[PDB]
Amino acid sequence: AAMTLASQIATQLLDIKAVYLKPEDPFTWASGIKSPIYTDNRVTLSYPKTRDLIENGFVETIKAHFPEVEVIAGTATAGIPHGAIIADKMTLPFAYIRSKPKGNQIEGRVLKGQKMVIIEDLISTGGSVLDAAAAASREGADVLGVVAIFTYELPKASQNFKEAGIKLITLSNYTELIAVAKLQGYITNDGLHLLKKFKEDQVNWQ
Amino acid sequence: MTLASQIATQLLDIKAVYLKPEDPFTWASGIKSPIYTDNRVTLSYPKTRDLIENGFVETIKAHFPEVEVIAGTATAGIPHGAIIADKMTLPFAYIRSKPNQIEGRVLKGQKMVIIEDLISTGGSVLDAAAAASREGADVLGVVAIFTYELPKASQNFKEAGIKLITLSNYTELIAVAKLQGYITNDGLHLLKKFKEDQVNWQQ
Ligand SMILES: [Cl-]
């Protein structure tokens, strides 16, 4: 009970296998990339204890970073369940933002100038949630920022958010998760070393 | 007012439902419809959303006390189902519209209530229901915000052998529309005829 929120979330993600770490037997991602990590935080939705931790963490970080928020928008599709729960908990309007149109991406009703926080599940490059913010801004939102469950901490995501001028907060992150994984025996020191290389360079980490 | 008429009053007010009997919408099938529904806008009105989500919880708590997972139909049923699951401290999952269609984790034989925002023919949610069943869920039933009360939907559900519960319905909603002046008696008559016959109601 003395762990950071980031570390508590990582503990539970590993425990419920929302995240698997197999640095010495890696996954193949799309695009021919081998990865020591697989993430599916939609699994958290099926574990009320973990889900409550995450949704309560989101509400707390939003109040802290974006107290003037007027609308909670979830990124289609993975960010939607979390966003809806957050909006219910804060007694705020909810909207969601499609990946593409069927004046067409926001579902719900958002007033011009309404202050929005956008909810995302996972940040890799941030491209998806950044495009969501772009669509929201086109349709009249005042986007305060983004909150996500987790980030791979890729330098490219930092660059994307900075260049876009959009604040990102995350509840947990790659560094805390691989740290907790080793502490808890999910990975060996050799595995931890490989995971650190993966953050540095996704192509030549092996 | 009953919960159904309360819901309907708020759907009309926030323009989640548009009634145009004298100038109908056209459906993919070619049917002209006096009604358009977008219940996603309920999500942006906390008073209305609270009423709907609490309504869902009560009816699930009564009709499906053995439910072990709440599943939302992608995409419009997802936000409602997620809030329902949070309120009930239950597992949540959701079901993709097309192909592994269950997202989340559902074990074999886990008892599932499926959440939908609108029943027109019921085809989408029944496709959701078959996919979840193929993947091991024990589908208990479907609950939806609103139904057009189409005979096609009734027969679809009876054939599939699946219970449908709804919070509000076409008949009660067009009654509130007339009472509140959103339609005239002529429009109400047209709306009633559409429900009895979707092909010949303008004749
Ligand atoms: Cl539509």
How many other C-beta atoms are found inside a 10 Å radius of the C-beta of residue A49?
12
DSSP secondary structure string for all residues of B63-110: H-TT--EEEEETTTTHHHHHHHHHHHT--EEEE-S----EES---TT-
B36 vs A: CB within 8 A: no
Nearest CA among A171, A167, A174 for reference residue A153: A174
Tokens (6 digits) for B49: 């959303």
For B58, what's the count of Cα atoms within 13 Å in the CB-facing half-sphere? 10
Contact in structure between B106 and B61 (CB atoms under 8 Å): no
Q: Spell out the residues 6+ positions from residue B172 whose beta carbon is closer than 8 angstroms to its own.
A: B2, B4, B5, B8
Nearest CA in chain B to A55: B86
A134 vs B: CB within 8 A: no
**Chain A partners within 8 Å of B41 (Cβ):** 108-109
Contact in structure between B15 and B41 (CB atoms under 8 Å): yes
Tokens (6 digits) for B126: 């029944």
A99 vs B: CB within 8 A: no
d(CA A133, CA A139) in angstroms, rounded, equals 10
Residue B121 burial (C-beta neighbours within 10 Å; 0-12, 13-18, 19+): middle
Contact in structure between B80 and B53 (CB atoms under 8 Å): yes
Resolution in A: 2.0
d(CA B39, CA B37) in angstroms, rounded, equals 6
Nearest CA among B3, B5, B42 for reference residue B178: B5
CB contact under 8 A, A92 and B46: yes
Q: Spell out the residues 6+ positions from residue B143 whose beta carbon is closer than 8 angstroms to its own.
A: B56, B59, B60, B63, B113, B114, B115, B116, B164, B165, B166, B167
Q: Spell out the residues 6+ positions from residue B151 whose beta carbon is closer than 8 angstroms to its own.
A: none
Contact in structure between B45 and B14 (CB atoms under 8 Å): yes
How many other C-beta atoms are found inside a 10 Å radius of the C-beta of residue B11?
26
Helices marked H in A32-99 — which ranges? 48-65, 79-90
CA distances (Å), origin B30, targets A104, B16, B114: 24, 23, 29
B51 vs A: CB within 8 A: no
Nearest CA among A40, A51, A96 for reference residue A71: A96
Strands A34-35 and A27-28: antiparallel
B73 sits in the region (left: phi over 0; alpha: psi -120 to 50; else beta) called: beta
d(CA B35, CA B21) in angstroms, rounded, equals 7
CB contact under 8 A, B104 and A46: yes
The dihedral built from the CA positions of residue B167, B171, B173 and B179, taken in this order, carries a sign that is negative
Helix axes B46-63, B3-13, angle to 10 degrees: 150
Binding site listing of A? 98, 102, 120-128
Tokens (6 digits) for A116: 């929005």
Contact in structure between B141 and B162 (CB atoms under 8 Å): yes
Contact in structure between A117 and A72 (CB atoms under 8 Å): yes
Tokens (6 digits) for B87: 């309120």
Residue B185 burial (C-beta neighbours within 10 Å; 0-12, 13-18, 19+): exposed
B75 vs A: CB within 8 A: yes
Range of the domain at B195: 1-203
d(CA B84, CA A160) in angstroms, rounded, equals 35
d(CA A14, CA A7) in angstroms, rounded, equals 11
B56 vs A: CB within 8 A: no
Q: How many domains does chain A have?
A: 1
CA of B180 to the centre of ligand 1 (A): 25
For residue A77, is the peptide bond before it cis, meaning its omega torsion is within 30 degrees of 0?
yes
We report the CATH number of the domain holding residue B176 as 3.40.50.2020
Q: Spell out the residues 6+ positions from residue A120 whose beta carbon is closer than 8 angstroms to its own.
A: A75, A78, A79, A128, A129, A132, A146, A147, A148, A149
**Chain B partners within 8 Å of A55 (Cβ):** 86
d(CA A120, CA A76) in angstroms, rounded, equals 8
DSSP secondary structure string for all residues of B17-80: EEE-TTS-EE-TTS-EESEEE-GGGGGG-HHHHHHHHHHHHHHHHHH-TT--EEEEETTTTHHH
CA distances (Å), origin A173, targets A54, A112, A135, B31: 13, 33, 26, 51
Q: After which residues is chain B broken (C to N over 2.5 A)?
A: 99
CA B189 to chain centre: 23
The dihedral built from the CA positions of residue A95, A96, A101 and A102, taken in this order, carries a sign that is negative
Contact in structure between B72 and A24 (CB atoms under 8 Å): no
Encode burial over A96-122: b for 16+ CB neighbours within 10 A, e otherwise.
bbbeeeeeebbbbbbeeebebbbbbbb
Chosen for mutation from B13, B14, B37, B44 (greatest number of chain A CBs closer than 10 Å) is B44
How many other C-beta atoms are found inside a 10 Å radius of the C-beta of residue A77?
18
Backbone angles phi, psi at B6, to 5 degrees: -55, -50
